[PDB]
Design a protein around this motif. Structure first.
Motif, short mmCIF file in Angstrom:
data_model
loop_
_atom_site.label_atom_id
_atom_site.label_comp_id
_atom_site.label_asym_id
_atom_site.label_seq_id
_atom_site.Cartn_x
_atom_site.Cartn_y
_atom_site.Cartn_z
N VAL A 228 0.76 -1.06 -0.11
CA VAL A 228 0.04 0.11 0.08
C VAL A 228 1.02 1.21 0.07
O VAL A 228 0.62 2.22 -0.84
CB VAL A 228 -0.96 -0.03 1.19
CG1 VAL A 228 -1.76 1.21 1.29
CG2 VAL A 228 -1.83 -1.32 1.32
N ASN A 229 2.07 1.26 1.00
CA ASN A 229 2.77 2.36 1.06
C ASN A 229 3.61 2.82 -0.40
O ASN A 229 3.53 3.61 -1.04
CB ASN A 229 3.79 2.14 2.18
CG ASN A 229 4.70 3.22 2.61
OD1 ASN A 229 3.99 4.45 2.64
ND2 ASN A 229 5.80 2.99 3.07
N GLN A 232 1.15 4.16 -2.60
CA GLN A 232 0.89 5.67 -2.20
C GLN A 232 2.08 6.58 -2.74
O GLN A 232 2.00 7.54 -3.30
CB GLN A 232 1.15 5.69 -0.59
CG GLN A 232 -0.74 5.08 -0.17
CD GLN A 232 -0.67 5.15 1.45
OE1 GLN A 232 0.25 5.63 2.01
NE2 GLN A 232 -1.73 4.55 1.80
N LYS A 233 3.44 6.16 -2.56
CA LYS A 233 4.61 6.92 -3.02
C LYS A 233 4.52 6.86 -4.47
O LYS A 233 4.55 8.19 -5.12
CB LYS A 233 5.60 6.17 -2.63
CG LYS A 233 6.29 6.23 -1.22
CD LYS A 233 5.15 6.58 -0.30
CE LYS A 233 5.96 6.59 1.20
NZ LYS A 233 4.81 7.49 2.29
N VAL A 235 1.61 6.82 -6.44
CA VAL A 235 0.72 7.69 -6.76
C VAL A 235 0.99 9.15 -6.56
O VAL A 235 0.62 10.10 -7.18
CB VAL A 235 -0.58 7.30 -5.92
CG1 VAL A 235 -1.61 8.50 -6.18
CG2 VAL A 235 -0.94 6.00 -6.36
N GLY A 236 2.01 9.69 -5.32
CA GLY A 236 2.27 10.97 -4.88
C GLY A 236 3.32 11.35 -6.02
O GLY A 236 3.18 12.43 -6.46
N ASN A 239 1.58 11.79 -9.03
CA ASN A 239 0.73 13.24 -9.00
C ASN A 239 1.64 14.33 -9.30
O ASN A 239 1.13 15.44 -9.89
CB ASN A 239 0.13 13.30 -7.77
CG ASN A 239 -0.63 14.43 -7.31
OD1 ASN A 239 -1.71 14.77 -8.02
ND2 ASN A 239 -0.41 15.32 -6.38
N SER A 254 -4.72 3.99 -8.08
CA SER A 254 -5.38 4.27 -6.79
C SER A 254 -6.39 3.23 -6.50
O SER A 254 -6.86 3.07 -5.38
CB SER A 254 -5.56 6.07 -6.58
OG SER A 254 -5.92 6.47 -7.90
N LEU A 257 -6.03 0.80 -4.14
CA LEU A 257 -6.22 1.24 -2.89
C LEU A 257 -7.59 1.55 -2.15
O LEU A 257 -7.64 1.37 -0.89
CB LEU A 257 -5.32 2.31 -2.37
CG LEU A 257 -3.41 2.28 -2.92
CD1 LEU A 257 -2.81 3.38 -3.05
CD2 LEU A 257 -3.03 1.19 -1.85
N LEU A 263 -0.74 -0.35 5.94
CA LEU A 263 0.38 0.26 5.03
C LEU A 263 1.10 -0.83 4.60
O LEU A 263 1.25 -0.69 3.28
CB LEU A 263 1.05 1.16 6.18
CG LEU A 263 1.11 2.79 5.70
CD1 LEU A 263 2.12 3.57 6.36
CD2 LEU A 263 0.55 3.19 4.38
N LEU A 396 9.25 16.69 0.20
CA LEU A 396 9.11 15.69 -1.10
C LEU A 396 9.76 16.00 -2.27
O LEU A 396 9.99 15.27 -2.93
CB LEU A 396 7.64 15.59 -1.15
CG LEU A 396 6.46 15.21 0.03
CD1 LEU A 396 5.33 15.68 -0.24
CD2 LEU A 396 6.91 13.70 0.17
N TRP A 400 11.26 12.92 -4.94
CA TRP A 400 10.71 13.09 -6.18
C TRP A 400 11.62 13.21 -7.36
O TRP A 400 11.55 12.42 -8.23
CB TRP A 400 9.76 14.13 -6.29
CG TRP A 400 8.33 13.86 -5.62
CD1 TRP A 400 7.81 12.46 -5.35
CD2 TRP A 400 7.30 14.72 -4.99
NE1 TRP A 400 6.52 12.70 -4.72
CE2 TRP A 400 6.25 13.88 -4.40
CE3 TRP A 400 7.39 15.96 -4.88
CZ2 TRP A 400 5.23 14.60 -3.84
CZ3 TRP A 400 6.30 16.67 -4.43
CH2 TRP A 400 5.09 15.86 -3.90
#
Ligand code: VVN
Ligand code: MG
Ligand code: MG
Ligand code: MG
Lengths: 402, 552
Positions: A228-229, A232-233, A235-236, A239, A254, A257, A263, A396, A400
């Motif tokens: 999941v984590n 999430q990373k 997706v971030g 994004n 997403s 999720l 997590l 971040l 990135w």
């Protein structure tokens, strides 16, 4: 023998910059250098009716000490004077020649000499500084290459004639000489030009390869099992990257999720999610659409400490419209500490910046100001100094660009 | 005696002319004093009577602070119109940077400024006038031929002249040290006190040949020297004694002068603190505005009075011994340091208590203290010291490695003198297995200032707490506080707040905000915490549900 009238921009007085304090070792070296410079008439002592000041520093380009004058403030106050070769960045090889010693054969306008005043500071305010001004064209003053330009064209005209495809760009105290020859032919052509320069009484003591350096594209992780984590990373990051590349999508990623998951729960990468991510790795390959260099606007550089001797940087003029990005690696090699690394990185970015656009960028440095003001000369080798400020890297932005 | 030194050329600021400040009328007593002083000064060439053509004037006055009279001139206008000069030295040498000398002599230059000539073309702009009785007659025109006292160029031109004048004497005596400061000279030597007095007498007569009068061997100031807030004994230095006032009320001005004296004492009094005191000036509306003293300021000031009770001194400098600095933590945010070459013979001491940010941690602050000590050592001794630090390599290496900002760490040795400097906690670099995942969010009405903090966990627990007079940023931290409060010793937290993430990742251990200080207490008590970030309003899952909850 005859000097060239020089003036300050209207409604401006000369520089009055503080002299940073120095170790006894560096003051000792500056007094030796300046004593001989005065013996040769290049500088003279000055009286209290001269209120001006430019900082001076002792550096190393070797084991003998060199003297560096921070004419940033004077340069801003004289920019009045008088196409940058876009092919230089293309050449297979580019070699940099320090031709700053040419300047010291040229009288400086007697009315302008006061503006070049500088101080050698003492320890613990025992004495006031030793105070000099320049009689000749000083290294680092942006007026120096402008005044010498006609002489430089004269000395180079022969060599350019023999070598019509070799690119020669001047920035401050340095010549940038670029060829497509094989390296051994290149270094020979450099040696000829050095010989031609020397025998015309112009002394000279670093090769780049601008054809290789590329603008880094965004790199997405490749994993066997995704938690999941991790999603999430992913997706971030994606994004973030979609402020730059329009076509990125996260709908399928997403969806994986939906719910309220622990997590560390392993999420298999379903088919549509993998397709979306594969497409997104493709979008991150191409370059951005409408990002062009405006020569009127300033260049800005940002740097991020990535750990283990790595540093990411971006050069841009409008936020998120990157002209260049890069990553520097450092070999531990005994010391190679953080400041040595940042200081080398700044020099490489500036050099690259000079080659590509002909101006130096303004740096946003991730370091405490006083720490920088204290140690930057322990590792500085260039004869130029860019502008810089001090900032606190966002959280971040680091991961990135990693 | 006017000296045959060359004059420094002086120009007026370009496009300005000389001052024409008309002279204020004077009592016949003051007019008599001026006429007699001016004739004595004319006798010595210090000023000259001038024709009628000179169109300039500067007011003159006569005073005798309640025996003798002094002549005072108001060059304010002329000063404003004359060019700038290389700033006369401001900084002064610090006693901890002087090298011990066997004999040191203090010479005062009598009428320093009047002993130096003023360049010719600038003399016209110094014209002044002694008023006639009541304008009954025309007054006396005079102009200066030497550096006038109070004119803008006198301090720098004097110092320049003194320096040139010294050179030839210093040339033939490289075994004698001469400090130059204002109109003083401080002359040191390790010669036999006999030939030291010999060399002093030579130097005085050299200065006399150049127009500079010096004190006799029976009027030369004797030690220990009262100099610029210091006492310079032959083998030690210390500050002159500090008197902290006692008052029932304190104005912004009384506090400022108080932080001043304490700052002064910290260079040799170990332990001085001024943080809570100068917090009192964070607004400092007016110098008169009375400021109530907080309880912490009271205790700070009380503890300082205790330290001032004992007497303390510093030592002089030995270029051949090492330079060593130790730092001790001294309460929250406040640090103390000593610099020495001999284990109990301090050269000097100092403090560092800057937050320079709303939140920090101990390692950050110690690294900053090491910075200020480094700058100070370069200034005073032209080298950096060795550091003895109450922090282990493990602690510091971990921090500067994980620290996103570039940092220089000098050679130091760990000194085990509690309180040692430690990381109080460390966030996880990876999410924790088997630990509950809290999806937190906060929201606040940007107008009513009412808010909520909520969570939703993977075990199916949800909760919302109401908030009054709050901000979207304060709630985002409050949500994180909540999840800490309602979780076990291990917890994963997921937030959409870059603000809140930024603060927590920085790993502070002290804060101005009580909420951040509360989160910090939770973080210590926790065994493992992993914090993760997702973009908001992207329907991730967990984040979407706690957004739906708290946004309702
Ligand atoms: C060791 C014994 C001592 O007594 N001092 C003080 C340290 C010796 O340093 C010196 C060296 C050379 C010349 C003068 C020196 O002294 C001063 C240095 C700097 C400023 N000063 C102001 C005064 C006064 N009023 C005296 C000095
Ligand atoms: Mg000294
Ligand atoms: Mg602060
Ligand atoms: Mg939110």
């Amino acid at each position: 023998i005859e000097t060239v009238p020089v003036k300050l921009k209207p409604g401006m007085d000369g520089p009055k910059v503080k002299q940073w304090p120095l170790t006894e070792e560096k003051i000792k070296a500056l007094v030796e250098i300046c004593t001989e410079m005065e013996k040769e008439g290049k500088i003279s002592k000055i009286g209290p009716e001269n209120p001006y000041n430019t900082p001076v520093f002792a550096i190393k380009k070797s084991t003998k000490w060199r003297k560096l004058v921070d004419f940033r403030e004077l340069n801003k106050r004289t920019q009045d004077f008088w196409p940058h070769p876009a092919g230089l960045k293309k050449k297979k090889s580019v070699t940099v020649l320090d031709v700053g010693d040419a300047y010291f054969s040229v009288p400086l306008d007697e009315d302008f000499r006061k503006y070049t005043a500088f101080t050698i500071p003492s320890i613990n305010n025992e004495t006031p500084g030793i105070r000099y001004q320049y009689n000749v064209l000083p290294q680092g003053w942006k007026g120096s290459p402008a005044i010498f330009q006609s002489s430089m064209t004269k000395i180079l005209e022969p060599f350019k004639k023999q070598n019509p495809d070799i690119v020669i760009y001047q920035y401050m105290d340095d010549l940038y000489v670029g060829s497509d020859l094989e390296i051994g032919q290149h270094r020979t052509k450099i040696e000829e030009l050095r010989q031609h320069l020397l025998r015309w009484g112009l002394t000279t003591p670093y090769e780049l390869h601008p054809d290789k350096w590329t603008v880094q594209p965004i790199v997405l992780p490749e994993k066997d099992s995704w938690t999941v984590n991790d999603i999430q990373k992913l997706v971030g990051k994606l994004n973030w990257a979609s402020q730059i590349y329009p076509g990125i999508k996260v709908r399928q990623l997403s969806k994986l999720l939906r719910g309220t998951k622990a997590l560390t729960e392993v999420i298999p990468l379903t088919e549509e999610a993998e397709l979306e991510l594969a497409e997104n790795r493709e979008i991150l390959k191409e370059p951005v659409h409408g990002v062009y260099y405006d020569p009127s606007k300033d260049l800005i550089a940002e740097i991020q400490k990535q750990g283990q001797g790595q540093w990411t940087y971006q050069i841009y003029q409008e936020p998120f419209k990157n002209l260049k990005t890069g990553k520097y690696a450092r070999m531990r090699g005994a010391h190679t500490n953080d400041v040595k690394q940042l200081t080398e990185a700044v020099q490489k970015i500036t050099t690259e910046s000079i080659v590509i656009w002909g101006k130096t960028p303004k740096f946003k440095l991730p370091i405490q100001k006083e720490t920088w003001e204290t140690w930057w000369t322990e590792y500085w080798q260039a004869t130029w100094i860019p502008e810089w400020e001090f900032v606190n890297t966002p959280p971040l932005v680091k991961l990135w660009y990693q | 005696p006017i000296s045959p030194i060359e004059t420094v050329p002086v120009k007026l600021k370009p496009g300005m002319d000389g001052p024409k400040v008309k002279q204020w009328p004077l009592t016949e007593e003051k007019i008599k004093a001026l006429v007699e002083i001016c004739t004595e000064m004319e006798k010595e060439g210090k000023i000259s009577k001038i024709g009628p053509e000179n169109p300039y004037n500067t007011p003159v006055f006569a005073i005798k602070k309640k025996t003798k009279w002094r002549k005072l001139v108001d060059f304010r206008e002329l000063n404003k119109r004359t060019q700038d000069f290389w700033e006369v030295q401001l900084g002064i040498p610090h006693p901890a940077g002087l090298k011990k000398k066997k004999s040191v002599t203090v010479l005062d230059v009598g009428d320093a400024y009047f002993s130096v000539p003023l360049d010719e073309d600038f003399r016209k702009y110094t014209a002044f006038t002694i008023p006639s009785i009541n304008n009954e007659t025309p007054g006396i025109r005079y102009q200066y031929n030497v550096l006038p006292q109070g004119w803008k160029g006198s301090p720098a031109i004097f110092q320049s002249s003194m320096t040139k004048i010294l050179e030839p004497f210093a040339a033939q005596n490289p075994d004698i040290v001469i400090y130059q400061y204002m109109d003083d000279l401080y002359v040191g030597s390790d010669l036999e006190i006999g030939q030291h007095r010999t060399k002093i007498e030579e130097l005085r007569q050299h200065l006399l040949r150049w127009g500079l009068t010096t004190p006799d061997k029976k009027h030369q100031k004797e030690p220990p020297f009262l100099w610029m807030g210091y006492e310079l004994h032959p083998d030690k230095w210390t500050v002159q004694p500090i008197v902290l006032p006692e008052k029932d009320s304190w104005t912004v001005n009384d506090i400022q002068k108080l932080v001043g004296k304490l700052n002064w004492a910290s260079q040799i009094y170990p332990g001085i603190k001024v943080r809570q005191l100068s917090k009192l000036l964070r607004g400092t509306k007016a110098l008169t505005e009375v400021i109530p003293l907080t309880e912490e300021a009271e205790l700070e000031l009380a503890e300082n009075r205790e330290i001032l009770k004992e007497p303390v001194h510093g030592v002089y400098y030995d270029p051949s011994k090492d330079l060593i600095a130790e730092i001790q933590k001294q309460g929250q945010g406040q640090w103390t340091y000593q610099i020495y070459q001999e284990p109990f013979k301090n050269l000097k001491t100092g403090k560092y208590a800057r937050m320079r940010g709303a939140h920090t941690n101990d390692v950050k602050q110690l690294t900053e203290a090491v910075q200020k000590i480094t700058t100070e050592s370069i200034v005073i001794w032209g080298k950096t010291p060795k550091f003895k630090l109450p922090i282990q390599k493990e602690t510091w290496e971990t921090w500067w490695t994980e620290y996103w900002q570039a940092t220089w760490i000098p050679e130091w040795e760990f000194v085990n003198t509690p309180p040692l400097v430690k990381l109080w906690y460390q966030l996880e670099k990876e999410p924790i297995v088997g630990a509950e995942t809290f999806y937190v969010d906060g929201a606040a009405n940007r107008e009513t200032k009412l808010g909520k903090a909520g969570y939703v966990t993977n075990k199916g627990r949800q909760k919302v707490v109401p908030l009054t007079n709050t901000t979207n940023q304060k709630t985002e931290l409050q949500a994180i506080y909540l999840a800490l409060q309602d979780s076990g010793l291990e917890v994963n937290i997921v937030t959409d707040s870059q603000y809140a993430l930024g603060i927590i990742q920085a790993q502070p251990d002290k804060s101005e905000s009580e909420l951040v200080n509360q989160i910090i207490e939770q973080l210590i008590k926790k065994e493992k915490v992993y914090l993760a970030w997702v973009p908001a309003h992207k329907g991730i899952g967990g984040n979407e549900q706690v957004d739906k909850l708290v946004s309702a």
